[PDB]
């Protein structure tokens, strides 16, 4: 079952009913001001910091879900309805919502009145704009009144929801019914004290009335769906004093048959320098100059239309670096549009706010910053370089990393600390990705401090050295890296030993020392230590590179012996040196992470897909038998049915959810890539479709969440809810899946010395063309594909056959045509 369809031409998802399985959202804003917006106009906006600068209030776990947002109550002769369906839930003759790139439109019609609203954050503005079009679709005259509505938040959302002892007495507003281009309301809570900012909520016409007090607009004992003011048919003109400020205007709208009217509403964020705060000598009236200027740039449909077209041009030009054309329009839409959009949004939003993440936490993982980079470095390489320098500057001098990074402050979280021993190597991963994409080896000479300490600067390359050496000097009894608090898997806490509720599994370590080791870090060391070695050699450090290849070699031996269970890689050794991820046990026999990543690193790979005695093939075959499902590969199997106190968070989930038997879409890509590595393209693409949004659209009633973006986790086979997704949008899944399909399935991936063209996608995509822009040139790669396991691409560059899979980088400006046959 579907609840809409894609519109590829318009680069939108078109939702054709209000009755989706869950609220489906979009993100607006591409610089500093962001909005979450559901297909029912739910959500909120904030400037930079969703915790400390939220303009508007939103309730998570509302009954029903998502029943606050930007509403427009229509009163047509005493019948009240909203085009967003919620909150009033009147029967509409028509409904559609379209989520596009940085905008959405929502349209509702009832009793001969159509209302369409376009919501977007314009480039260069800290504001959410709504262009509303009202149309009389009947054969008689209409007299309407439209009441806009938005509920303010008192800026700090944490305080807003908890400190009512103070904050029910601080709500303040100013009202401006005769504003230079219409009518406006200013929310200025705490402007009298330390805030240099306020919010403005305005419309570009004379409002017949206004309301700034929720309780007055909505009425006692009422829900938003039963708001009294709209039902009365006129604003109460209320002025807030404490309690709950809102922004609402009534606008009178008369229409002949077939007539329409346009209106432009603006919700804006405004900051004044300290010495320009006040309009008046007595300091009681906010200085609205900047607010009037913003409102003057959106006083007409014409100006609003142009901003929308500049928006569209931003995204069209943004997503013009990698594209594909094929027989598979599901593949194409994901690759060309929705996967790249999703990766940009993860850049912008980090892990801040979604309909699952509540916007109070402002950090993200160090490892997430680097990994997210892999997916967007082709779109915004200068922002990427900056990011890398930013996070490397927080790194400790011993090479250890802050586990949590705070993008807003460019600092590591001191409360959480360090100790997650996979963190340091991800910096090599990011840096190398950046350099391969851009060729900017100069980043390695950039002076970068440790723990942001002035005077401590060394070249970025040296930070790479400290990351590498950290692993070498932190190994256990079998030569595998010590795991510390956890590795990529935040729930594998082998030094925790917690029996007290409330204690954090990640940072509590009730016993010290121990010999706990991770095979994931081992694979990560083999993969990224080989990248560091390459950078070192290229840098001219011959010895450094050679010792590095030495430790890497040692680590691949360690993995194939002490890291190997017989038919798959162990997951770890625990605090007392007993194995985890062994068929010797009833539960947790096989874990996916090491299988994927170790093979990605080339460990155990033999002569080809038919070399079944190769450890890589045994492992991937074991993954197929034991972990694969119709909805993806689960994390481990069997799942644990009782608490394993020696293992931390992992067994606290019911079987089949999150880290205890969940499908993490973030780590499936590691096995998809591994499958292309050993030569089984068909299998790899199979696995990719099972977790990818365009292919899961036909089972929307099962996925539940948005059919146009990846989610973090799909319920596993041991769950009653097998197939249902949670934690949509903000996830590393986007990046890793883009890397997988663009670089390994389609096979186009930048190297230091050239573009590698190495497709492995199997028989389902017989013909396709990739257009890639790299180091200033365009590469048109046309591929004819038999899909045979083990068949690799032979290249013809500009008419002449070449050996190998590497296409040397052409001068900027040029166009290189590559033909590939396999």
Could you give the residue numbers annotated as active site? 490
Non-local (6+) Cβ contacts of 248 within 8 A are 147, 148, 149, 150, 185, 210, 211, 212, 217, 229, 235
DSSP classification of residue 138: S
Q: How far is CA 44 from CA 41, 408, 488, 641, in A?
A: 9, 19, 31, 40
Strand partners, 344: none
The token pair that represents 268 in the structure block: 């804006």
Query: What is the greatest pairwise CA distance in the chain?
Result: 86
**How far apart are the C-alpha atoms of 402 and 390, rounded to whole Å?**
12
Query: What's the Rg (C-alpha) of the chain?
Result: 28
By C-beta, is 141 or 164 nearer to its own copies? 164
Given the complex with its own copies, which of 529 and 655 has the nearer CB atom? Answer: 655
Query: In angstroms, what is the minimal distance from the CB of 90 to its own copies?
Result: 12
Cα–Cα distance, 343 to 737 (Å, whole number): 10
State which residue, 152 or 687, has the beta carbon closest to its own copies: 152
Beta carbon nearer to its own copies, 40 or 737: 40
CA dist 266 and 270 (Å) reads 12
Contact 16, 98 (CB under 8 A): no
Which lies closer to its own copies via its Cβ, residue 39 or residue 618?
39
Minimal distance in Å, beta carbon 722 to its own copies? 10
Instruction: Find the shortest distance in angstroms from Cβ 147 to its own copies.
Output: 16
Gap between the Cα atoms of 505 and 658, Å rounded? 15
- Least separation in angstroms between residue 195's CB and its own copies is 5
Query: What phi and psi values does residue 117 have, to the nearest 5 degrees?
Result: -125, 130
Record the tokens describing residue 510, joined without a space. Answer: 């009730």
Least distance between its own copies and beta carbon 714 (Å): 11
Nearest approach, Cβ of 64 to its own copies (angstroms)? Answer: 5
Nearer to its own copies, 86 or 677 (CB): 86
**Of 64 and 124, which has the nearer Cβ to its own copies?**
64
- Nearest partner of 146 among 234, 217, 62, judged by Cα: 234
Total length of the chain:
822
Q: How far is the CB of 63 from its own copies (least distance, A)?
A: 6
CA distance 428 to 532: 6
H or E element at residue 121: none
Backbone angles phi, psi at 687, to 5 degrees: -60, -40
d(CA 119, CA 637): 45
Nearer to its own copies (CB atom), residue 455 or residue 501: 501
Shortest Cβ 212–its own copies spacing (Å): 13
CA dist 665 → 39, 220, 262, 314, 761 (Å): 24, 46, 43, 29, 19
Cβ atoms of residues 426 and 370 within 8 Å: yes
* Vertex 596 angle, CA 595 and 597, to 5°: 100
Tokens of 582: 């062994």
């Amino acid at each position: 079952m579907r609840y809409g369809h894609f519109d590829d031409e318009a680069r939108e998802y078109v939702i054709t009913t209000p009755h989706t399985p869950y609220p489906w959202i979009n993100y607006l804003g591409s610089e500093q001001f962001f909005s979450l917006l559901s297909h029912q106009a739910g959500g909120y906006s904030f400037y930079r910091d969703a915790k400390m600068r939220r303009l508007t209030r939103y309730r998570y776990n509302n009954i029903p879900a998502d029943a606050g947002g930007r509403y427009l109550y229509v009163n047509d002769g005493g019948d009240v309805w909203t085009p967003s369906w919620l909150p009033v839930k009147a029967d509409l003759d028509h409904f559609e919502a379209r989520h596009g790139l940085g905008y959405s439109t929502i349209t509702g019609e009832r009793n001969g009145v159509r209302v369409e609203t376009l919501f977007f954050v314009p480039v260069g503005e800290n504001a959410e704009v709504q262009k509303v079009t009202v149309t009389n679709t009947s054969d008689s005259y209409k007299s309407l009144t439209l009441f806009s509505f938005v509920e303010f938040c008192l800026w700090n959302a944490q305080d807003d929801q908890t400190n009512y002892q103070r904050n029910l007495s601080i709500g303040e507003v100013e009202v401006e019914q005769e504003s230079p281009h219409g009518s406006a309301i200013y929310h200025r809570t705490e402007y009298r004290e330390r805030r240099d900012h306020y919010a403005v909520f305005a419309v570009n016409t004379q409002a017949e009335g206004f309301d700034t007090d929720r309780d007055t607009f909505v009425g006692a004992y009422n829900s938003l769906g039963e708001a009294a003011v709209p039902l009365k048919g006129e604003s109460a003109n209320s002025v807030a004093s404490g309690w709950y400020p809102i922004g609402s205007h009534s606008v009178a709208v008369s229409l002949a048959p077939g007539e329409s009217r346009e209106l432009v509403y603006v919700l804006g964020y405004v900051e004044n320098p300290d010495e320009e705060k006040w309009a008046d000598d007595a300091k009681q009236v906010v200085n609205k100059e900047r607010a009037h200027a913003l409102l003057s740039r959106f006083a007409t449909s014409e100006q609003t239309d142009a901003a929308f077209a500049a928006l569209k041009d931003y995204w069209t030009d943004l997503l013009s670096t990698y594209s594909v054309s094929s027989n598979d329009e599901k593949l194409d839409r994901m690759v060309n549009i929705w996967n790249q959009y999703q990766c940009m949004v993860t850049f912008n939003m980090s892990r801040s706010a979604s309909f699952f993440e509540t916007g109070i936490g402002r950090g993200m993982g160090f490892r997430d910053s680097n990994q997210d980079l892999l997916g967007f470095v082709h779109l915004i390489p200068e922002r990427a370089r900056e990011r890398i320098i930013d996070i490397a500057s927080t790194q400790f001098a011993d090479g250890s990393a802050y586990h949590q990074y705070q993008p807003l402050t460019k600092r590591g979280n001191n409360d959480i600390g360090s100790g997650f021993n996979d963190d340091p190597l991800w910096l090599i991963a990011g840096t190398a990705a950046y350099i391969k994409e851009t060729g900017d080896f100069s980043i390695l000479d950039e002076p970068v401090p440790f723990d942001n300490e002035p005077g401590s600067e060394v070249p970025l390359f040296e930070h790479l050295t400290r990351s590498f050496e950290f692993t070498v000097t932190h190994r256990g009894p079998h030569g595998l890296p010590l795991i510390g608090r956890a590795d990529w898997n935040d729930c594998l806490n082998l030094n925790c030993f917690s029996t007290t509720p409330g204690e954090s599994f990640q940072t509590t370590e009730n016993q010290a020392g121990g010999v706990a080791e991770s095979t994931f870090i081992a694979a990560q060391f083999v993969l990224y230590g080989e990248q560091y070695a390459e950078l070192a050699a290229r840098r001219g450090l011959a010895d450094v590179a050679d010792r590095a290849r030495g430790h890497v070699a040692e680590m691949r031996d360690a993995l194939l012996t002490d890291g190997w269970d017989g038919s798959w890689f162990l997951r770890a050794y625990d605090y007392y040196g007993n194995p985890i991820g062994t068929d010797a046990h009833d539960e947790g026999k096989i874990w996916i992470e090491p299988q994927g990543f170790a093979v990605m690193a080339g460990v155990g790979v033999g002569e080809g897909p038919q070399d079944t005695d190769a450890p890589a093939i045994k492992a991937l075959d074991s993954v197929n038998e034991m972990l694969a499902t119709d909805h993806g590969m689960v994390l481990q199997y069997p799942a644990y049915t009782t608490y394993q106190v020696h293992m931390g968070e992992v067994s606290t989930y019911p079987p089949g959810y999150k880290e205890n038997g969940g499908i993490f879409c973030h780590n499936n890509p590691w096995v998809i890539i591994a499958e292309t590595v050993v030569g089984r393209g068909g299998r790899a693409f199979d696995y990719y479709k099972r977790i990818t949004p365009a292919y899961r659209e036909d089972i929307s009633d099962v996925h539940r969440l948005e059919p146009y973006v990846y989610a973090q986790m799909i319920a596993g086979k041991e769950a009653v809810r097998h197939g249902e997704a949670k934690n949509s949008w903000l996830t590393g899944t986007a990046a890793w899946n883009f890397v997988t399909v663009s670089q390994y399935l389609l096979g186009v991936r930048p190297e230091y010395d050239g573009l590698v063209v190495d497709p492995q996608i199997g028989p389902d995509v017989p013909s396709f063309t990739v257009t890639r822009v790299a180091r200033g040139a365009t590469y048109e790669i046309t591929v004819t594909n038999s899909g045979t396991d083990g068949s690799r691409g032979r290249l013809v560059v500009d008419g002449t056959p070449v050996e190998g899979n590497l296409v040397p980088y052409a001068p900027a400006g040029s166009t290189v045509r590559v033909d590939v046959t396999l």
